[PDB]
Amino acid sequence: PLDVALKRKYYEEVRPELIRRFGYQNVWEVPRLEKVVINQGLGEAKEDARILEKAAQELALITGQKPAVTRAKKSISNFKLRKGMPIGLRVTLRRDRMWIFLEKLLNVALPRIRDFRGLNPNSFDGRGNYNLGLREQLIFPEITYDMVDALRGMDIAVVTTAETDEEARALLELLGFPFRK
Amino acid sequence: RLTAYERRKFRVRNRIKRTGRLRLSVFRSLKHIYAQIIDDEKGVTLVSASSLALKLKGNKTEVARQVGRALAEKALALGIKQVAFDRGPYKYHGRVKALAEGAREGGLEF
């Protein structure tokens, strides 16, 4: 395993502060990150230039991992959707890669968001997971202007072993997720 | 509400029972590996073999193969030759494959 700064920050600073703040009787009861699942709901590729090999590439640069395709469960009219059609990507970051991503997201990406005024305090699950949406992929340090054909966003799920919203807030906030209110 | 494990397990066991053989069932824990040869007509085990019971050693795979041979031995001595391999929820591979090859060398018929 890699020494990656944020990972260590978790074990060194966040771990204990949490045990203080909520008083766990058990090493496993304390909140862990489980997985960060990034999704590009896309379908701007339904027919058109269904070469979103372009996006799979972009995501593979950002996460260091190649996404797998998602396809439509049922045929849908008004979106022009025949069943089986490639409409999305999903890359599931775990372990080291999950940390490396989150590191750069927190350090560099979110800063680079236009008029960024903090993440949303309310985007919390109620079973203690967080989700957040990006509008563009130029946010990440790996993707320059020069290399992009068209602006595309994404959904980020961050999945925690917390049982409650209130605990999961502490974990992500302590790790450094900037919340607006 | 069953799990992929509970299903997988049923699905293979169901096929094996259908053929009516004595079934060589295999349990594989994080540390050990056990083997009952069971008669399902009677709901009974006829011969056992475990890494736990053989106080066997180290490399899990090599160990498996050993319980494998062990099982066959007590088995032929009881007149059992033919039998059906119950890979449980386990891919026939690894420790299980190893156990299987061992009961084979051991002379078990399958």
Partner: protein
């Protein structure tokens, strides 16, 4: 991981405009960014960038008191 489908992750330095340097990993060894957590307004306590006004308007006009009582 599956071979041949995944871009390599190597030690990588992200350099911000504040003059901050981040020791992290990427598919690119050296990256220059225009902003980061160390210098971003929202992050930097509450650095009220350009507009430290206190509104300023509109009671706070005050030119002047010279109308009489």
């Amino acid at each position: 991981m599956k071979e041949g489908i995944h871009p390599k992750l190597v030690p990588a330095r992200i350099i911000c405009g504040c003059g901050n340097v981040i020791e992290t990993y990427s598919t690119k060894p050296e990256i220059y960014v225009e902003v980061c957590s160390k210098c971003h307004p929202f992050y930097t306590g509450q650095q009220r960038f350009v507009d430290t006004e206190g509104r300023v308007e509109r009671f706070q006009r005050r030119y002047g008191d010279s109308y009489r009582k």
